[PDB]
Design a protein around this nucleic acid. Structure first.
Ligand SMILES: OC[C@@H](O)[C@H](O)[C@@H](O)CO
Length: 422
DNA sequence: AATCTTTCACACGAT
DNA sequence: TTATCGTGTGAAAGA
């Protein structure tokens, strides 16, 4: 039979956190292909296997007699339906692979879709199916000044974008901004997702902060920060490109798949520019005829696109189980009700089932399934964490985790805090 | 008439 | 030479 997670096993997990994680990184919109064309998803969706649990699982499989081909994670990716065969990714030796030739035909009538990633081990032991976030289908980018009512295609401060340069409508020339080897590079094989933070015009340099909310407009100062390494570029002014020129006076919202240039703030007309694998500053030339434009190098024009990340984390808390781990529950948000006679926490998210219980630290809570997107649980008394406490004496923070009946543990990033009364 | 989005069509420059 | 592949850009068709 399947063994329920014990308090001892949960304490062992919480100490180490050797999870297996699957990340799916992708753009938030995709341009459709008409007739027989293939307009590829750019940047190419990327599946990453993170966490120390993949190595531990491989050692367990080999110890049980599996060869390296048998213990290797395999993955296929496809669009939500199809009609298209799924494409095989190759994860051997790397912990990631990009899907470089996905496209969506106009014969597909959906306005939005998710990528589906199917994973199993080389011996055919099933891992399961993992969905991307939603991707909006577009016919082609609009040429008109964007309206903030198309909130949908605008770029909010604090969200993530990919940036890429392509030289002469040539697919082979495409390079993405990507941090690797301690530096910003322009890679043909991997791409970074960069937080784009709006700064007020008065912000100076480093390290340092000041969150400004709102949508990004041309002429605004931004900071781009690698979502993986945290590496930041200097303050940039984002500028509209048309032809081989940057516009100095444009002030409209930046939108999906626009071409933009990044002026290095406070420099003499220096722009972020690609040279082969290198990212450099290159100086624009003024147009003596139009004061509000300057001529920029081809390597200084970048296509911007918003990106998203689906992240799924699982751990065999009671050892290998018969049932595949998916659909992996995801908790988006927690809310303390309070409300009535007993304190309840409401979890909002996805893939919830009645076979999940909420654990607060190493304490299993009474859990009430409402639907795939909603579960309630009863908050443990503080005495479950501090023996003898009759009230919350000092703040106490506990992790919140979901646990399946066979002991599979699904980590959340979220915590619950007990706070003393005023 | 003029505008904006969607679909069709073909040029550009790569292989 | 032409043949063909993604990609960019306009024309055409729809709203
Ligand atoms: O590059 C133009 C060549 O002469 C033809 O092959 C076409 O331009 C390609 O469609």
């Amino acid at each position: 039979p399947p063994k329920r997670l014990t308090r001892e096993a949960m304490r062992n997990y919480l100490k180490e956190r050797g999870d297996q994680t699957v990340l799916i990184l992708h753009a938030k919109v995709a341009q459709k292909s008409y007739g027989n064309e293939k307009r590829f998803f750019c940047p190419p969706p990327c599946v990453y296997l993170m966490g120390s649990g993949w190595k531990k699982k491989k050692e367990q499989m080999e110890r049980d007699g599996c060869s390296e081909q048998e213990s290797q994670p395999c993955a296929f990716i496809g669009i939500g339906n199809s009609d298209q065969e799924m494409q095989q990714l190759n994860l051997e030796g790397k912990n990631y692979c990009t899907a470089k030739t996905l496209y969506i035909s106009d014969s597909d009538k959906r306005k939005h879709f998710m990528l589906s990633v199917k994973m199993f081990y080389g011996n055919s032991d099933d891992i399961g199916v993992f969905l991307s976030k939603r991707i909006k289908v577009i016919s082609k980018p609009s040429k008109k000044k964007q309206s903030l009512k198309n909130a949908d295609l605008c770029i909010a401060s604090g969200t993530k974008v990919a940036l890429f340069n392509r030289l002469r409508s040539q697919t082979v020339s495409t390079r993405y901004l990507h941090v690797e080897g301690g530096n910003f590079h322009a890679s043909s094989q991997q791409w970074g997702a960069f937080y784009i933070h709006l700064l007020d015009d008065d912000e100076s340099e480093g390290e340092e902060f000041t969150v400004r909310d709102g949508y990004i407009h041309y002429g605004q100062t931004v900071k781009l920060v690698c979502s993986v390494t945290g590496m930041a570029l200097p303050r940039l002014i984002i500028r509209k490109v048309d032809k081989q020129t940057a516009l100095l006076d444009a002030d409209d919202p930046v939108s999906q798949l626009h071409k933009c240039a990044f002026y290095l703030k406070d420099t003499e007309r220096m722009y972020l520019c690609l040279s082969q694998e290198r990212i450099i500053q290159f100086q624009a030339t003024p147009c003596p005829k139009e004061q509000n434009k300057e001529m920029i190098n081809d390597g200084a024009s970048w296509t911007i696109i918003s990106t998203d990340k689906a992240e799924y984390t699982f751990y065999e808390g009671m050892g290998p189980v018969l049932a595949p781990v998916t659909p992996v529950p995801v908790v988006e948000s927690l809310q303390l009700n309070g409300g009535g006679d007993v304190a309840m926490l409401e979890l909002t998210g996805q893939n919830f089932t009645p076979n999940l219980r909420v654990w607060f630290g190493d304490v299993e809570a009474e859990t009430m399934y409402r639907c795939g997107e909603s579960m309630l649980c009863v908050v443990p008394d503080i005495s479950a964490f501090r023996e003898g406490w009759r009230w919350v004496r000092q703040p106490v923070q506990v992790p919140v985790t979901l646990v399946r009946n066979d002991g599979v543990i699904y980590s959340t990033s979220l915590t619950f805090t007990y706070t003393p009364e005023p």
